[PDB]
Structure formats: structure tokens, C-alpha cells
Nucleic acid binder design. Structure first.
Length: 341
RNA sequence: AUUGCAUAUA
């Protein structure tokens, strides 16, 4: 049951209702779809005084609002465009509920918004609360975004305990749908004193990751953003095994990236691989050009190839226009000869 | 993903 005021506001009997005019009914309006939207909108127009009028009523039951399907937007509003005193007050209502919040559907949205806007000191304080709950957090549909949020906003040295828990896990986590999301963030924001052990666990698993639904994602991330030496390491593993990884669903994609991102020289050595090396009757190319995955790799290959190497690959392909005609996964490889007709 | 893949609120 809602106060007669809230209802009346629902029917739209207040076209110019003001913030002041709702005093004593914040909490109620904040837990209401439209009441919530109304407050949100108003806040922006509101003076510091007006704003504080709202802050007082919500501060008292902040916890409630933070886990509320509608309330949490109101709290987030204060974390962004709000006084430093207010943010600290809210940060303070967080003390001791971080984890439960982080695993919570609306709570986690507030934690994230808080992480972005509150000072380092309250930041680190929040982070701590996750100690010994990292993995549980990482594997949480809610918790994971929070974790990703720390890694990007928080000081990397307040993060060691994270790394610490990832030891002996990197592989398990890179094959997790939420876990691989955290690994990846970590590769972008963390210190070499921390990313050294991760890239290490990863290489020692390359062959497995490259065929994992999620493992490949991590791999592609390194091929696309990592250090040249860490790329080459990956590039070393794909060599000799190009034909097989290409008809695979997930390694297919990784192979394209090795291509797309390898040194000019590596890219020559891989392109040669499918032309020189053999698969029974014809070359690997003959086999790939008609596959449902490898046909993409051929394509990518033609695109990056140096004019010099483009010719052969083409030369090698031309002799089989007869088969590719009769193959759907190869109708693009056909037209591609246009580029080279 | 277009013949081939992943990302939690009104």
C-alpha cells in the first residue's frame, strides 16, 4: 500500500510537483519506478540545498535503497554528481556489506558506481572487504563486474591479493565465462609484477586455451594488445598446426589473429605453412578453402598477405575453381579472386 | 557472427 500522495503522482495529478513537495516521502518514491525517475531527473535541476533535503531521508535507509530494483539509481545519482561529504557518508554505509552488495543484483551496480567516484582511500577500504572472497566474486554473475570494476579504477598495488588468489587458477578462470572477463581486465590494468605470473600460466596452456570457448578470448586479447614477445610465443605454438586449428570452431578465430597481428615475417611463415605443407592429395589450402571455419582463415590470409605472397596463395587456389564452385563455405573465397582477376 | 563466438538493472 502506497501513500495517497504516491498514487496521486502515479495518475499524474501533479504536473509540476516539486522536490520540496515530497519531503517525508523520499524512500517511498525511490522504491517506485516513476517516483524514482522523478527524483533522478529533479536532482539534476536541484540546488545544493534541495539535494541535501533528499540526501538526509535516503542516508537513513541507504542499505535498503542500494539493493532496490528502483532505489539503486537514486543512490548512484549521489555517487556521481554529489558533494564529497555525501559520497563519504554513503561510502560509510558500505563498510561491511561490500561483498553481500557485490553479489547482489542492484547492490553491485552501486558498488561499481561508487568505485568510480569515491577517493582512493575509501576505494581501497572497499576492495579489502573482498579479501578471501575473490574467486567467489569472480565466478558471480553480479560479482564479476564488480571485480572488473576494481581492476580498472583501483590502484594495482591494492590488488595484489587478487593476483595472489589467481595463482594455480589462471587456466580454470580463463575457461570460465565470467573468469575470462576478469583475467582480461587484469592484463590491461595490472603491473608487470603481477601480469608476469599470469602470462606465464597462460603460455603453459596455450594449446588448451586456443580451443576453449572462452580460453581463445584471452588468447586473442594478447595477440591484440600484448607484448610482441608474448605474441611470438603464441605464434610459435600455432605453427605446424595451422590446418587443424583452422577447421576448429574457436582456434579458427585465434589463427586469424596470429595472422592479423604477427610480425610481417611470422605472417609469411604461417601463410607459407598452408601452401607448402600437405594434406594427402592436395595442399592444406584445398582442404581449408572448403571448410566451414578454415575458409575464414584463408580469407583473412589473402587480405594481409604481401602482394608477393598473395600471388602464390592465389596461384595455388586457382587450379581448383572446379570444387569451390560446389562449396558454400567457399563462395566468398571464389569472388575473392576478383580482387585478383 | 555475413557461412563461424562472450560480456549482470526500470
Amino acid at each position: 500500500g502506497r501513500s495517497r500522495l504516491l498514487e496521486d503522482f502515479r495518475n499524474n495529478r501533479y504536473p509540476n510537483l516539486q522536490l520540496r513537495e515530497i519531503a517525508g516521502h523520499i524512500m517511498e518514491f525511490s522504491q517506485d519506478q516513476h517516483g524514482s525517475r522523478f527524483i533522478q531527473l529533479k536532482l539534476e535541476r536541484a540546488t545544493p540545498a534541495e539535494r541535501q533535503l533528499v540526501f538526509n531521508e535516503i542516508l537513513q535507509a541507504a542499505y535498503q535503497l542500494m539493493v532496490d530494483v528502483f532505489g539503486n539509481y537514486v543512490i548512484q545519482k549521489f555517487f556521481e554528481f554529489g558533494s564529497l561529504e555525501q559520497k563519504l557518508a554513503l561510502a560509510e554505509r558500505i563498510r561491511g556489506h561490500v561483498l553481500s552488495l557485490a553479489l547482489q543484483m542492484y547492490g553491485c551496480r552501486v558498488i561499481q558506481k561508487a568505485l568510480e567516484f569515491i577517493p582512493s582511500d575509501q576505494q581501497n577500504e572497499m576492495v579489502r572487504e573482498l579479501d578471501g572472497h575473490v574467486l567467489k566474486c569472480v565466478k558471480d554473475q553480479n560479482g564479476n563486474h564488480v571485480v572488473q570494476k576494481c581492476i580498472e579504477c583501483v590502484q594495482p598495488q591494492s590488488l595484489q591479493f587478487i593476483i595472489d588468489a589467481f595463482k594455480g587458477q589462471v587456466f580454470a578462470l580463463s575457461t570460465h565465462p565470467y573468469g575470462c572477463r576478469v583475467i582480461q581486465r587484469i592484463l590491461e590494468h595490472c603491473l608487470p609484477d603481477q601480469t608476469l605470473p599470469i602470462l606465464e600460466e597462460l603460455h603453459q596452456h596455450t594449446e588448451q586455451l586456443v580451443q576453449d570457448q572462452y580460453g581463445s578470448y584471452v588468447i586473442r586479447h594478447v595477440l591484440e594488445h600484448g607484448r610482441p614477445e608474448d605474441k611470438s610465443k603464441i605464434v610459435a605454438e600455432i605453427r605446424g598446426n595451422v590446418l587443424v586449428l583452422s577447421q576448429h570452431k574457436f582456434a579458427s578465430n585465434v589463427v586469424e589473429k596470429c595472422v592479423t597481428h604477427a610480425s610481417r615475417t611470422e605472417r609469411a611463415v604461417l601463410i607459407d605453412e598452408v601452401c607448402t605443407m600437405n594434406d594427402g592429395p592436395h595442399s592444406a589450402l584445398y582442404t581449408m578453402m572448403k571448410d566451414q571455419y578454415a575458409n575464414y582463415v584463408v580469407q583473412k590470409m589473402i587480405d594481409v598477405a604481401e602482394p608477393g605472397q598473395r600471388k602464390i596463395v592465389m596461384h595455388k587456389i586457382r587450379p581448383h575453381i572446379a570444387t569451390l564452385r560446389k562449396y558454400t563455405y567457399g563462395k566468398h573465397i571464389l569472388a575473392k579472386l576478383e580482387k585478383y582477376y
